[model samples]
Target: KSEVAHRFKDLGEENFKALVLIAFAQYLQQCPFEDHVKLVNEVTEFAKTCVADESAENCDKSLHTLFGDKLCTADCAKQEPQRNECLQHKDDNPNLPRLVRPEVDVMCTAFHDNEETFLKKYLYEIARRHPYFYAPELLFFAKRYKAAFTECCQAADKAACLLPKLDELRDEGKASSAKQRLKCASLQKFGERAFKAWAVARLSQRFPKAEFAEVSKLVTDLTKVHTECCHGDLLECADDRADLAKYICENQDSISSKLKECCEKPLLEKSHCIAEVENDEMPADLPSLAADFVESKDVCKNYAEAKDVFLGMFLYEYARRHPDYSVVLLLRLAKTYETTLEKCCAAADPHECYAKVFDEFKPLVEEPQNLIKQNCELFEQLGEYKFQNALLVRYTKKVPQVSTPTLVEVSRNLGKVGSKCCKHPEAKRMPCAEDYLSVVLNQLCVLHEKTPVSDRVTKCCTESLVNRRPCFSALEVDETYVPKEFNAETFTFHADICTLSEKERQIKKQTALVELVKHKPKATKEQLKAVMDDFAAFVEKCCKADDKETCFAEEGKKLVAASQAA
Candidate 1:
């Protein structure tokens, strides 16, 4: 600290050096892992005159950078009169009392002689002083720390290498009070990083069977949330925050207690963990949901399926609002519809397959003339006269080559629906229209519920026929020069359409997903929340499932409502 040294103009170099060393070493030897990290962080800020900042790319620079852009001017090394250029001390503040140096050697000697006594007398005392701490958390930290240190000592057989405690800390609210407890002048450079390493090491040693990734996630999240809380907003991390990790870090004490309690309980009859909420469990926050949603095996399996369902619903919604759809985007929407038809067809039981698709195919099979206005309006307006064929091919999962004639019949009825959709005067391609479409599709799909010999229905019409039209118009080919590549220009319309329609379809899918998930067989958020609130409420309501808040207050229905609302 060139600036701090400048304050001690009368003191010699070595004397001031000792003052800083004593402050640092004392800090490390005494504080908890967190306190050690935060407290010395302050001194490093003021005395960061000696270290280099550059290191491996992964290194998260310490506040006390030795050298770099934020470094103090190297030219300020000439001694007292000229210390730092940016901060000039007109006169030394000699009237102020000299800072206290922690009793590093004394605490180290005490701990070395009596570890348990030192823990009982000192370790917890320091944790109690830090606002971000809890007593039980610090206790577990100590257990872990002591266990790690023991392992390290056993490996080295060198008592001198073991860490020592610092006894001079005042436990004041300000970090300055932790000033005297850091490691020595030489190791002080690694103060913050080193403490973090030590804490991790210790925790690992004591909790050898613990899920370390989850713990680390919890710890990192805690740090991030704290930083954001003090410096920004929690929801700033709404989409991809590490709150799960942070919550674990913040509540390790309670977790540790739960761990112990679990150890004391008998194992679950069916699983490694209890499948049901037997009553005392508190609700989990968003992070837990995100973590499970992202990584759990079952979640990963359903993710793609769910995404497709959601996208379908979203597209339907989007079409509802947009009146004039771009031809290309509409093409892409058709492709997604093709994919959905294939997937759901495959997933649905065979008995339901034939019936599932029968109603849909019946439209083009029988009602071709009912909605001819669309042929002249929307479909023909885009310079295409085959809207009926496109609709039949896109929707009906029947064999294209053989069912082509039957598809024409389906197209006619679909044409009637389409003609009505755009000309309903209120038809703005609203999302609700997709709901109507879903209803129609669902009925038709029911006919195809019985399995067919093959689902090799190739969606070749759009890319080969409709898609070729754009390619011919967009490209100016040289004579005898065939194109090697097609640009987004050929597909831009479809992509944009997918973006809009998919957006609406995604929302609608979420609603269906919620319903489908209710029937899903697994331990789920729905089940968990239900157990937390329902059984009792349903008992009071006689299992009606439709009771509202106005019914009664004394009933446990409030618990269900509160948990659900929460």
Candidate 2:
């Protein structure tokens, strides 16, 4: 300690300060990937300028003492494999002193491991990611490294070997990167909602027949637009839709130009081909609660009976009140029903199922005490998967939001937790398993409670809920009793749409009706807009003021007649 302190004193104020700055920079890993080699050179040159031969040798001895055999020597630094090996094995070396900053070792080791995983998984995601930028390079990497699959990654010839592996992942349609990489690489910048919009808007304009091969031409442009305009902005502004829309509109020209180029390339080449454009980004939107709530394809794929029963009961009752509502409105209402009858309404008699379901749901306006039993039964009935989904459906309805794949993972962990913690004892169901689950549900349902009361559930739940989504903590149950993230806020008898003012409801309905007209028949944009404007005025006078069904049906017939004449 004294010798090191003496050396520090000898370096003098300026040189010591500069050396401190350099050491901190290394601790920060502030050097960019491409600049890493250059920074090493610069550091070496600076060392020569600052220290004489003997001082440098002594400095090397000190560093060697600090890092032991794990430190890279001059010869090892020349080889990439050895260089990385030096980085990879920084921890647990008996001869080394304690890490000056443990996090630096942790960070370096994590990055090194993650890079190998990234190369393997991202090799496939490249189709949707930087396809134009990397597909060819990937092919070349494989070709160059065909003889060196294990060692080739450290060398320059790393592309060709990836092709065969990519083919394997595609054939299986599975290969996942780490959580962070999946977000940036999976969907590139084309979100699920945005991707669908592009397909609808430019399929005909850009491709001859929307052939798969024709789609590859558009990859470069789409990726470029997302990088230049949307990337981090979308990440930050995701909560503000109006702002997001404005930003998107401002950049529409650039987005449009790239889309055009994407479509045109296939035509110009006269050789349409396909590349994978799969997305790894978690979608930013969920179906509107007023539409597609319970039995969407994902939910139905696992459980259809509950879905059908719920829909049937919903439609029967919903129709009785809004007696003059449009079929469109009726269906939308059914799609958006987030909770089960027991949560907010009495169960209908199976005989008078539809009618009873309707009457039972007329806004209970009271004690939610029964909700506990209702949820327990429903959870048991639906099993782990559907129960979690039902809760997610309810959560989104309460608070409209979309999340990254972390939520999906949260769902997975919940299922695992239930199986693990909810164990039964042959010696009288000690109720620990059930008790374990009950505690979790209570924490989730009562959002105001910050932490799980039980120690058993604390670690995993706390880890899962840390920092990202406060409401997500609701899902953190006992170590084994994971539940999906949901808005643990209490539910009400009123529908989400009911909260909107009469005026707002009218406007929303009119907008939806106008949007519907966009797909009616084969009308051109001009004709559609003209009719839409005319219909907008009519909606104010007719639909809003009069009976909903009468106004909509009458207008529909008239529009059909007008369209046929046009």
Candidate 3:
């Protein structure tokens, strides 16, 4: 053992120790089987004991016995192994001032055991995160990890551990990622909402057929469209997430270049509000809010953020722009990420910050005594949705087997539930979704908790998928808008519709009536004046017919067109 100790120590003397450490590191990362952490830790302690008590001969033999020829065989005394065999043992020696020879096995045991344990914990931690973009990846890596962890658990409890609720977790990740894409896309440009949602759902369309190639195809298009259109102008994700982060980072210039085309003015730019807008639902009194809020191309452009310097800057912007609202929003996002990421927001932990927010804003809302509990309840339901969706959809792509009316009632009940989240004090008959606004990974702010986004997506998906419908019914087009008010402020939101507006229909009718004069007017000139008067009577009569859905308001425009043409 002393001789072996001398050899081991000598390896470090000549850079051989470095090799040992390297080898062990490699072995740890590439461990082929499961539950290796226990074996390695146990062996390491055994090596340490050998170093402390045994003779050089005994130490070497004991150390070898710890590895049990299965790991490092070949006779040192009789059947000398070649360079490769000895080289494998040198992982611990790689780049080292390594442990003493007797400590070599101890070192290997220590390193490998620690590594395996860390991985096991990591795998489950992420698996449990369920509803994020990384869910699928985490789920894929979780199975072996869970098996290994179970082996380390209570002996009798081992088999019954049932993977720490792993199936739910696995579905959680897949469903969450899918939901994120859908939600994020909801806030995209109109054309993008259509193209990207189709691009996104295209992958899910294959959820019913998840052959690797098919899935990969969907993954490819997701990458392609996201890369193509999601730049600083539209799909900004300062505090967004890995789903967008990884996608943007991989194809910065390529995607950026493609998205730039949408910036140009076309006969009708598909990306703009008015140019491509097939419908106009403007505010009657709020002009700025009317045009930009519903369908302006650059309406909310400032909210966009590139992935490179987004996180802190965004939060900082929130802090600078709306300090109070920023604090609340950040707290909400951090909590969400913590729950979904299954850990703290390592990039920006807010345990202290929330304390600051909590203390400072303690009086913002009366006795937030139950806020924590409410958030926890929201989180629990969010988790429930992810698991439910995963079981029904991730594993099986078709609509869930549950009855639509039951789910509809549940949604209606949940609407009350969801509304309770978004409901606000009517200060004096105001229409606001403020009570329900929340940003991902931020602390929430408001009188009413808006449905935690997870709950929103999960419940909505349950309702939609099971019913085979869209959020507001299958649409020719849809675009959702998120405000960029920094911290909460009075802000306008917008989405463009590709369907016709009643006003546009009224305008189209008037335009056609006027165009007919170029080719055919009443046979006599005396009748021309009377014909125009009759048109007005006809228009007025149609609106009063009482269907109440008539496109009458644009008559204000018809009067102008008639004056110019006449």
Candidate 4:
């Protein structure tokens, strides 16, 4: 009992209760029918004790009494396989009445009746349903639900306010769920030790200047986050991730390059953006493994003997060399490799089956790499104003029915992403642009969800957030939609644009380009360039004229006539 209390001494009060409830729930569900009554009585007694004491030690005592030898250790909870075995056995009762979560209305009514009681009910509901969930994360959501209700109940129409708030919370929960599931799946697919190895190698490559001890500290912290998060600790996972971001942001000068865009984001977003920043340089000390492991005669035997270590080394070696690739992309490569090996090893002729593995992976790597390279080069060459105008033109042509302002806003946001990311050191630019640009596309998708302008745009917006960017990337221009005829008013810029700051003048010029594209969607690139050249010539000549307005009107007419003639 004392050992149990000592083991969980660092746990918060709410987390303690959650752990106790989970232990009780798991025991009650699996224990014999005859033992159920006794356990029920014990739980009732423990509840009374909690009401009076509510301390970690008291909760620990309750857990010890309820499960005794069967009590699942906190250490076991950290491990997926052992945790599952500890929580449920093959011989466990299958006919027991399953614990289910109460509906929102039931919970809201409970809250309306009594705040304290509702909290208890909420904790029990969450714990029973998600027994393996990181205790702190479960408690976090319990508190969030309470906080949400507190705000909602204050409104004149409580239910109306509460429903949408809860729905939003549910959506966030789903995203957390998806993220944790992916982490666990990766952990299970690649062994924990191997995953850790890959992570360490990746981070070391990313922060090449850091001392070994500092790198080890970062690996340890991140490993703990993955362990807890994969076991279902969403809130603490985010908090720990944020802490890692803070560490990097604070120590960026020596350990990492400038991360102005990533560090400036909100806490959660900051962590996410920072994570997308790729390795700046490859470590020279890493041994090259140019030959494919799948080609070895003893590949299957070697993999079977030490799957995690072997695969971990593979990832470590590969990641060290590919500094330009994002961690996710590298992981995908590893996953594909594993899948190929699995199929080949099971085949009649293993070598023959796996002979083309590298060949298969070539296009996957080259395509995205080429795309990112092209994007970065173009962005760097065109500069911000021209780059943004290009995006504005592209989007306007793609979704012609959409209003110009929305497209302009989207282009501007995307241009900021490009401007911020494309300036990164060569190795880091691809991932920086990939991540930040996707964020802009994601926002555009959300903005257009309710009222999509085109079928293809609707399809892209309706896709999952992860796939939304690719869907948008694949969009083609709407050929059937005709643009409005050229408006002379678009070219009639006030002389004030000339007297404005240099930055403002560039902005006005960019806006004029956008209007030109919007008004003449069918204009060839050459024709559009001709009109912009004339417009620029007008700006230089008219802005310097003795009578600026007259010069502007006369040049604007000539420009409009030339555009109409084209």
What are the candidates' C-alpha RMSDs? 32.1, 27.4, 28.9, 16.0
In TM-score terms, candidate 4 sits at 0.48
- Residue range 363-443, candidate 2, lDDT tens digits: 321112133334546555766644544443333222222222222333333333344433432221212222223233323
Off by over 4 Å in 2: 1-31, 41-58, 61-161, 166-566
**What overall lDDT, based on C-alpha atoms, would model 4 receive against the true structure?**
0.60
- Greater lDDT among 1 and 4 belongs to 4
Better of 1 and 3 by lDDT: 1
Steric overlap count per candidate: 66, 17, 47, 0
TM-score ranking, high to low: 4, 3, 2, 1
Q: What is the lDDT of candidate 1?
A: 0.32
Error of 4 at 102 (Å): 52
Prediction 3 TM-score vs. true: 0.21
Q: Which ten-residue region of model 2 has the weakest summed lDDT?
A: 270-279
lDDT of 4 by residue, 376-470 (tens): 67788888866776677777777776646557767776776667776778667655665455555644554454356667767765543334455
Error of 4 at 47 (Å): 25
Worst 10 residues of 1 by lDDT: 177-186
**TM-score for all predictions?**
0.16, 0.19, 0.21, 0.48
Return the number of clashes found in candidate 1: 66
lDDT of each: 0.32, 0.32, 0.30, 0.60
Query: If ranked by lDDT, best first, what sequence of candidates would result?
Result: 4, 2, 1, 3
- lDDT digits (tens) for residues 383-495 of candidate 1: 32234434432333223222222334334444444544555443233222332232233222222222222223122211232232223223221222222232222211112
